[PDB]
Amino acid sequence: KLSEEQQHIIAILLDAHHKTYDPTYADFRDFRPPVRPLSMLPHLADLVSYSIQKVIGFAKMIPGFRDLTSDDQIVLLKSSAIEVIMLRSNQSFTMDDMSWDCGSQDYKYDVTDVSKAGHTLELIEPLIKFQVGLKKLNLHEEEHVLLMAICIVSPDRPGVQDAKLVEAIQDRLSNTLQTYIRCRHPPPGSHQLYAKMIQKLADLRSLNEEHSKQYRSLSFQPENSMKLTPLVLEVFG
């Protein structure tokens, strides 16, 4: 049974997503232009920096997140940011040409664009496999926002001080997701769907690891760090 509290949780997360994800992509005017020699780094840095701000606005609205200490909210956001950003990018991803289509040809990003920001196939090959496997789950919007929230409130992140309380908030979301799939997701789409969504969180841990490896390599060159944003530098180190 989907309890009143569980229906409440889903309504809040749906609204939180709608308030932090603009599918018209109107704010892309503010970013430095794409040029298609890490030519795409300024635009894609600006894209990530904006996405970080939106992920924080979403996180503050997760029920229970703001009962954590400041240090624990910060630990959870720094360690989850690139994972949530990859999850939230799935909305624009298209399997027609394996690209992120943000409403315009100028703002349509393929593997060649990502390599033009300094990243290699060690990241991009698994990233595309991930985007494809997630897209094939055909998540309900309700499932998509629960997954983003569960990703953020993870108790095994390093530096987490009050892991017992992080685990308590995450379990409320996981039981909400598990019960939602049983009551509202018709078969055969629902077959092993929760286990498949948890596997995507595992895939995201490996993608996180490789991202930071490549981030440390490119950001160790000051000529590249000059093209990043202050917020990207605070979050990714």
Binding site: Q53, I56, G57, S70, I74, L77, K78, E234, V235
Partner: peptide, 10 residues
């Protein structure tokens, strides 16, 4: 050591 995150979370 994280002023902008702290301000955004406030």
């Amino acid at each position: 050591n994280h002023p902008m995150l702290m301000n955004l979370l406030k």
